[PDB]
């Protein structure tokens, strides 16, 4: 994004944290501006010797080396959890077949088996069921409860 995020004279709107007392945990967001105590003297929010501002601007100029040119980054994290799944691919659904050996896919849960009308008393919230072996034993049709 050098054409957009760089300007003659240096674009400094984009910042990065340069000092921190410890490494960040995954997906932690720190926006604090407390003066970093590099030495033994408490800073009390006052910059100076061994008291530095934790942030610094990026120098994004159109003439900067590609290593230093601005890049826009998007990170997608996917929540493969045991809950109903609401972000799906464009893959179309099909009709359901019972009492046949079939290759089924319910919401990404894939397998091969024979699907039959069950008599299990699923609760209004319970999505699919499991057997003693922690294997999928019963499902809820995403389109039909």
């Amino acid at each position, epitope marked *: 994004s050098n054409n957009l995020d760089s300007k003659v004279g240096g674009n400094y709107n984009y*910042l990065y944290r340069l*000092f921190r007392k410890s490494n960040l945990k995954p997906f932690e967001r720190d926006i604090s501006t407390e003066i970093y105590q590099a030495g033994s003297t408490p800073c009390n929010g006052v910059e100076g010797f061994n008291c*530095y*501002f934790p942030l*610094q*601007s990026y120098g994004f100029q159109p003439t900067n080396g590609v290593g230093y040119q601005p890049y826009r980054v998007v990170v997608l994290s996917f929540e493969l959890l045991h809950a109903p799944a609401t972000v799906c691919g464009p893959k179309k659904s099909t009709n359901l077949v019972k009492n046949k050996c079939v290759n089924f896919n319910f919401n990404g849960l894939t397998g091969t088996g024979v699907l039959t009308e069950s008599n299990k008393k699923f609760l209004p919230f319970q999505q699919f069921g499991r057997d003693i072996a922690d294997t999928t034993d019963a499902v809820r049709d995403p389109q039909t409860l």
Partner: nanobody
Amino acid sequence: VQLVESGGGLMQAGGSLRLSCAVSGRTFSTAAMGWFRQAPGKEREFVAAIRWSGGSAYYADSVKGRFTISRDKAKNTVYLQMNSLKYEDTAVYYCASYQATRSLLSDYATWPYDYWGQGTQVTVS
């Protein structure tokens, strides 16, 4: 940004004088303002800078202990309190704006800034 200085004038040695400078536009909280001066026949010289957030101050050795820089956030105005004026303080004083945020405060003494005020003359008799 537009920078407008005021407060220059004639003062006797030993007196005190306050210059003012109003900042408008992209008033970055994580930036800094600096005051510099240029004496006749001499190069422009950095005096002091203050960060908008927190108000930590940095002074040139030539002015340390005599001058004070301050800023009023609500009014978007920065002030340089020029105490114990000496002949060597005679110069055109300019207030300049930085849009670059630096972790090391001392860098604002030497950083090339983005925008400069017009200057106000102080002459010490």
